[PDB]
Design a protein around this ligand. Structure first.
Ligand SMILES: Cc1cc2nc3c(=O)[nH]c(=O)nc-3n(C[C@H](O)[C@H](O)[C@H](O)COP(=O)(O)O)c2cc1C
Length: 339
């Protein structure tokens, strides 16, 4: 049945309620960046090397000094219990099985402690939104710290929610038996999230956990994050759900890698569906990629097992792409592989 990520999305459309599928699928406004996140990867062509000996392809790498089994990690996607009853518990168990990391949404349908309990041995990080209530915000960080999360991904591209048209048409809401368990979405954001935050707030947040700035699209902003003692950059346009008409993340990734001059790790999300997508981002300088929507589609198919399958498909696609490209490990993936 389901042999590639696209298949999982098709299945999901077939089993999910419309307002839920649309919430997860949608981009902002006319969805130009949504389409481009995908299309851009196709414009970067691969130049494989032959005869390199690829008999035992090692996908292992590290993320902020924590080993992972592959440079493909789960990105924050809110409210996963809308997709499968088990939601984030399923996701973290799948990550534990695979040996990769999970970035937990601040707006998760399961709490920080809950997810830690379901995936003790999993590498886990907290995506943080800066709430107008800074005591709320601080408590989220302190609970992450206590419950063994290894980094904070602070989202910096959402002072307001992007305008996702289908959510407006559908009057998007949580299903009744569900809540954001650590405590319509546009209005939520307007009420709860602080549109005033600045670089001064980044200074405030600089916990001893590593901090990654999530949502950077400009080299000058990347340099500023370095200057503020952050420990990484997640090149992200928020799944094309915030400002429409920004470039594809794979197209802005070279500027940002350049700008940071190797001082922090650079990650990418947005449009990763295939193992060659992973290869291209590593070639251009990313240490690892995050996948958002594919994980929700995995949940929609079969909860933990579905997410494990989506990650295993990506792992195998990436292995094959590495092998056919002449790469026996992630350290040998270089910029001559792409043009
Ligand atoms: C349904 C959905 C929910 C998301 N929820 C969050 C969130 O709660 N916090 C956050 O920082 N980013 C969130 N994102 C953005 C993702 O972390 C990520 O940047 C995006 O999904 C990556 O693109 P992809 O879906 O093409 O893989 C969400 C994205 C989607 C599609």
């Amino acid at each position: 049945r389901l042999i590639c990520i696209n298949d999982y999305e098709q299945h999901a459309k077939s089993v999910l309620p419309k307002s839920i599928y649309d919430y997860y699928r949608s981009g902002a406004n006319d969805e130009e960046t949504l389409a481009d996140n995908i299309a851009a990867f196709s414009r970067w062509k691969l130049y494989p090397r032959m005869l390199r000996n690829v008999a035992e392809t090692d996908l292992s790498t590290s993320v902020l000094g924590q080993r992972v089994s592959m440079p493909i990690c789960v990105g924050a996607t809110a409210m996963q219990r809308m997709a499968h009853v088990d939601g984030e518990l399923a996701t973290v168990r799948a990550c534990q099985s695979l040996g990769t990391g999970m970035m937990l949404s601040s707006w998760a349908t399961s709490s920080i402690e809950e997810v830690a309990e379901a995936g003790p041995e999993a590498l886990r990080w907290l995506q943080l939104y800066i709430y107008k209530d800074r005591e709320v915000t601080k408590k989220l960080v302190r609970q992450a710290e206590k419950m063994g999360y290894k980094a904070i991904f602070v989202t910096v591209d959402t002072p307001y929610l992007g305008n996702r048209l289908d959510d407006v048409r559908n009057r998007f809401k949580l299903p009744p038996q569900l809540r954001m368990k650590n405590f319509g979405l546009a209005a939520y954001v307007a009420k709860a999230i602080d549109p005033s935050i600045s670089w001064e707030d980044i200074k405030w947040l600089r916990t001893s956990l590593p901090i990654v700035a999530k949502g950077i699209l400009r080299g000058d902003d990347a340099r500023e994050a370095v200057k503020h003692g952050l420990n990484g950059i997640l090149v992200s346009n928020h799944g094309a759900r915030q400002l429409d008409g920004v470039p594809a993340t794979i197209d802005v990734l070279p500027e940002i890698v350049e700008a940071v001059e190797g001082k922090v790790e650079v990650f990418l999300d947005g449009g990763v569906r295939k193992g060659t997508d992973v290869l291209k981002a590593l070639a251009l300088g990313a240490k690892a990629v995050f996948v958002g929507r594919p994980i929700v589609w995995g949940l929609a198919f079969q909860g933990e097992k579905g997410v494990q399958d989506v990650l295993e498909i990506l792992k195998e696609e990436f292995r094959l792409a590495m092998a056919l490209s002449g790469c026996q490990n992630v350290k040998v993936i270089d910029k001559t592989l792409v043009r």
